[PDB]
Amino acid sequence: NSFSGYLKLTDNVYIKNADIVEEAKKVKPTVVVNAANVYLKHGGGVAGALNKATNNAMQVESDDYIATNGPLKVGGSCVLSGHNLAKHCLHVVGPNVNKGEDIQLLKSAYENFNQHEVLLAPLLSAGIFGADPIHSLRVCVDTVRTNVYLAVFDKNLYDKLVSSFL
Ligand SMILES: CC(C)[C@H](Nc1ncnc2[nH]ccc12)C1=[SH]CCC1
């Protein structure tokens, strides 16, 4: 968990302008969080980038999990292997607000982080799911109580988050 170059926002939330895949390769954290969907189909965004970096081993494992357990609920999670990127991957489903899913489920999504002492994570629901990224960071800060290191792969968005926060 050798995180470097983060800015501490609160007692337990840190943030960096970085690709989460590059962070995972350098740090080999105990847990990396995936911004997943309910069927664990890693087609784009953070999910597609993490899966590509495992050479599709994450997708093969996810398909087997879904066959045996069924889909996750919105706001839910499962713990699977982190493959070459981390000890574990915590797959978390935030609401797709562009498709009418309730934004209050973003609090339930972030609550899953509290089962792990230290996590490398992305900003939930901030991609194609359509939540305001600054609102997602506010819910993270007011929900997560364990130590989370947020990687945001966009310098313009990073600067807007840090200006709004501090
Ligand atoms: C908001 C956006 C810049 C961010 N993308 C990323 N954040 C961190 N590492 C990344 N690697 C590849 C994409 C990527 C997302 S997509 C879904 C949730 C958060």
Decide if 124 contacts 67 (C-beta within 8 A): no
3-state helix, strand, coil in the chain (%, to 5): 40, 20, 40
Distance between CA atoms of residues 20 and 85, nearest Å: 10
The finding on whether 32 has its CB within 6 A of some atom of ligand 1 is: no
Method in brief: X-ray
Q: Which atom of ligand 1 is nearest to the CA of 125?
A: 18
Distance between CA atoms of residues 126 and 53, nearest Å: 21
Distance between CA atoms of residues 87 and 109, nearest Å: 21
Q: Which helix (H) or strand (E) holds 155?
A: helix 155-165
In which residue are the tokens 């807007």 written?
160
Domains of the chain by range and CATH?
Answer: 1-165 (3.40.220.10)
Decide if 48 contacts 141 (C-beta within 8 A): no
Q: Is residue 103 packed enough to be buried (19+ CB in 10 Å), middle (13-18) or exposed (0-12)? A: middle
The finding on whether 127 has its CB within 6 A of some atom of ligand 1 is: yes
H-only helix segments in 11-154? 20-27, 45-53, 57-69, 105-111, 133-143
127 CA → ligand 1 middle, Å: 7
Decide if 31 contacts 82 (C-beta within 8 A): yes
Distance, C-alpha 144 to centroid of its chain: 12
